[PDB]
Amino acid sequence: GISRDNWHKRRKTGGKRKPYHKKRKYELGRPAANTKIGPRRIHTVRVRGGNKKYRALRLDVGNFSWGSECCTRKTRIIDVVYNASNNELVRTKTLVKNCIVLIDSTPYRQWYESHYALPLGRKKGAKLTPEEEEILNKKRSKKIQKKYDERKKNAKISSLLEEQFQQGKLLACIASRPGQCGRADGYVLEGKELEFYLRKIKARK
Amino acid sequence: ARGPKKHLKRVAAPKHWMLDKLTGVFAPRPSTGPHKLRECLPLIIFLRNRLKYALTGDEVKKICMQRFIKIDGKVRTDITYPAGFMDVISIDKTGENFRLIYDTKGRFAVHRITPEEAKYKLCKVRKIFVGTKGIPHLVTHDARTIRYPDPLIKVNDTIQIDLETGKITDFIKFDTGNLCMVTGGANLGRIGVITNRERHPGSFDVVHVKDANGNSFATRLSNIFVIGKGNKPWISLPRGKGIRLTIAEERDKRLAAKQSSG
Amino acid sequence: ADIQTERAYQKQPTIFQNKKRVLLGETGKEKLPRYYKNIGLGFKTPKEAIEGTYIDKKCPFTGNVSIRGRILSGVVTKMKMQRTIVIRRDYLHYIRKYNRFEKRHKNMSVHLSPCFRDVQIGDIVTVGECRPLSKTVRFNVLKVTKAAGTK
Amino acid sequence: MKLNISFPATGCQKLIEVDDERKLRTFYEKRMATEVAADALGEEWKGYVV
RNA sequence: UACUACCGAUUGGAUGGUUUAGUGAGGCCCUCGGAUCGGCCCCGCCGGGGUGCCCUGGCGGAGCGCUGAGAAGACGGUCGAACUUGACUAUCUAGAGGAAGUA
RNA sequence: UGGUGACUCUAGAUAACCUCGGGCCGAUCGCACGCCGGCGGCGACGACCCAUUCGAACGUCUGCCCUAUCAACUUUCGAUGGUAGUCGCCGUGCCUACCAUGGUGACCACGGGUGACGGGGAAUCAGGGUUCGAUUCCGGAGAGGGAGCCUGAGAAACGGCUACCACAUCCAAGGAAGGCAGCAGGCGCGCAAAUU
RNA sequence: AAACUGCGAAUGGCUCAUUAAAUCAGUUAUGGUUCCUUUGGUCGCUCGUACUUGGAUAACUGUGGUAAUUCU
């Protein structure tokens, strides 16, 4: 019986309307299904026209895109850190649109070394397992080492991202609506937006 | 209402069907189809009210259910099927072919055409879009979509369909100097030559048409159907040539038809 | 500062602004490319629109609205809300029995883009119909002409 | 009680009326779809589980 | 000689409408719940085929095996008729007394 | 590539994702029979998507009777607006969070009344007017009063369901069933209206 | 015949209680939506037992309960 009608509101002058018709079905609202972080649990809503909606009630994974590199990978979701609308959607860890979220970085790390042949997020102890040595220090052809070193002239990240790759957790912002399509998708925060949300998280805590 | 309506009262039926008051409470209520229900002839009205082949709706059911009526080359057993502007109604058993063309008073005439003419029709292109791997599309005024038209065909042009294949043979462009029929409004059923088109952005354009006797009239752009190129129509025209007589000269013609006949 | 006053990061949604680049452009000239469009009814986009730095999602020139419907005009009376003003439209209504007229008026809350700075009261705005932007706001300021005395 | 008793091996049924509460002690406080050895029903009912 | 209408105590009783406070039928959503019903396994009695082993074929048995489906019910949330007690207000009715005018 | 007065349109290119309460990519039916074991002619029922038709729903502008013995109202419990969301078929205070203090009014707001459903129309009429319109066409609303839902393309459906309130039926007293402001008909009400 | 399946039962009919910028009328808009059906398009565009797959359940047969239902 949640409704979205205009006729229960005051007029612009401030006088109250009398209702002339009672609640219709096309003016209905549904409960505000709050997504959490957990193993995947998605319910299905039958909507107007016979179409279909997806209430994600629990998500743990969704794909986020590195905007500068154009690298989109499916990635585990760690934690919610900042919600720009309410602060109580953070202590409850609710996933909605435009919320700031901590994601994994290892699908972006494995793409970065496979494409640019540089270490990223490695410690100064430099303990390297023999798995990634044969992709970081492979034997390769002259024409192919030419291409791999021609890529290395621009393979430079901001310092604000590499300290996140040090901890294995990038910062991302959800761009889709998880109550309406059952997915948590988005993009990795970079640049002015990144330092904006960094000082917001800094001032909030 | 709680949903779509299925009846039509007889007084609220379109005026050009020329139904009368006392034979019933209801009108035939056209089915959904290629033409709008304010702009169509249902097949039951054409077959007993115009052609007088039937005397009831039951006899129209009996005539149509013998698969004797082809509208645009396909058999229609629906008795309220909306036939419309420039559809070819072809009855094979009697050897007749008809095309629905407005009279000078804005009603569909019983226009008989030769079976040479009954293999084509003209359509007005209403929408062009490119869809799903760059295939261009048409949408005509009777809900046909055509893949891969000629790239010179633009919106408001008039193309020619072959009724068996469904493909374009040729087309007319929208330009001043071509011939029209008005398919809407006060000027409905009149025929003349385009002389002008004034473009008002954000609203409807106005097209000025000149009659064969020098009369001139405007319509909107959506009420314009390009018949022919220059002065030659690509179809046969009805009894009046799209020249609306005034009531005085119509009275004079009707009186001159009595002092000579008899 | 000077844009980011809200709790969420304001940006034009159509312009990507984290395109990586080499230091000869990363240090040389720093300019966010601005999105703007041309509304279609002969109205020309102001200079402050295409070069400004404000972020308004309801602006007719740099935001996501379309202008379609009725072109009207009123006179500014109240400038007291955030990015939206109140205009007054005066007209004469014909009473038929007396063959005469009476002065009526109607108010309109209308959205004012930040590209029209130096808008006083008493001057004539041209408004264009858009989609409903608020509970009572349906129009959008398209052109400002000054009052009679402001030289 | 009456006892609508069936036998799905040959599909023949029978209604036996038992007006003796000593026999019905076996079925009390049970549930549906729980098997009970029907020894208390008589003497022909020895190896019978219903 | 009678009517008319008021105040009217009764805070008569009953009913309605606004609100304070308290309660909350029912559906829907959510977190559980798991009465029951299957399948795949594991053995037993064992045919055929291929080769003591495997696939089929019939069962039967048990295993908190491991999964699928799943009703009652309950915590919570929401929508929310109604219920109780107030306050204000209105009406219908039982009601002593009287007054004036009405004739 | 194409279009519009105007796109953040259509089409294209790249990187991925693609919901167990799963998206499409045919395990369906008839008739006539066949041509060189294959290749088949008409239909019927389907089907994601696109377009069309019938709509629907939200908006734009102007327009309504009496009342000031109704002059200030709205804002606690959204009032007016901004930002981000949630929900919705979508636009939007529709709802939430945080901010701003706005919005309407003697050009009559707000409140009340109406023996007020609104129009097309009707009677009267020198010209101007005045009164009526429940009523067969169009639009709205409601099925005793409120409320909540299921199914479905479409309903907050009542010749569907679930409650409460008021009435009311059958009963073996445990329970069960209801909704004529459809057609008839009855009672009542009345000055006032027809055939089970 | 029955029964399962599909569709329709949201139209029509009735009434005028509510309702005073509300309804409604003329005008516009959806570039801000959904749409059974009809009509046209699309339906080897996908590079990865089929000469046909599996479990049920009505109608029917048979045994019943309740004072009582279009109960089961």
Oligomeric status = part of a larger assembly
Percent helix among the residues of chain A? 25-40%
The proportion of strand residues of chain A reads: 15-25%
Per DSSP E runs of 2 or more residues, the count of β-strands of chain B stands at 17
The biggest sheet of chain B, with number of strands, parallel, antiparallel or mixed sense and barrel status, is: 5 strands, antiparallel
Number of strands of chain A: 8
**Biggest sheet, spatial arrangement of strands of chain B:** 3-2-5-6-7
Number of helices of chain A: 7
Return the structural class of chain B.
Answer: mainly beta
**Category from helices, strands and their pairing of chain A:** alpha+beta
Q: What spatial form of chain B do the alpha-carbon principal axes imply? A: globular
> What is the helix fraction of residues of chain B, given as a range?
under 10%
Rounded to the nearest angstrom, the radius of gyration of chain A is 23 Å
Distance between the termini of chain B: 57 Å
N to C succession of SSEs of chain A: EEEEEHEHHHHEHEH
Query: What would you report as the Rg of chain B, rounded to the nearest angstrom?
Result: 20 Å
Report the sheet with the most strands of chain A, covering strand number, pairing sense and barrel closure: 5 strands, mixed, barrel
Give the strand order, joined by hyphens, for the main sheet of chain A. 4-5-6-7-8
How far apart, in Å, are the first and last alpha carbons of chain A?
A: 39 Å
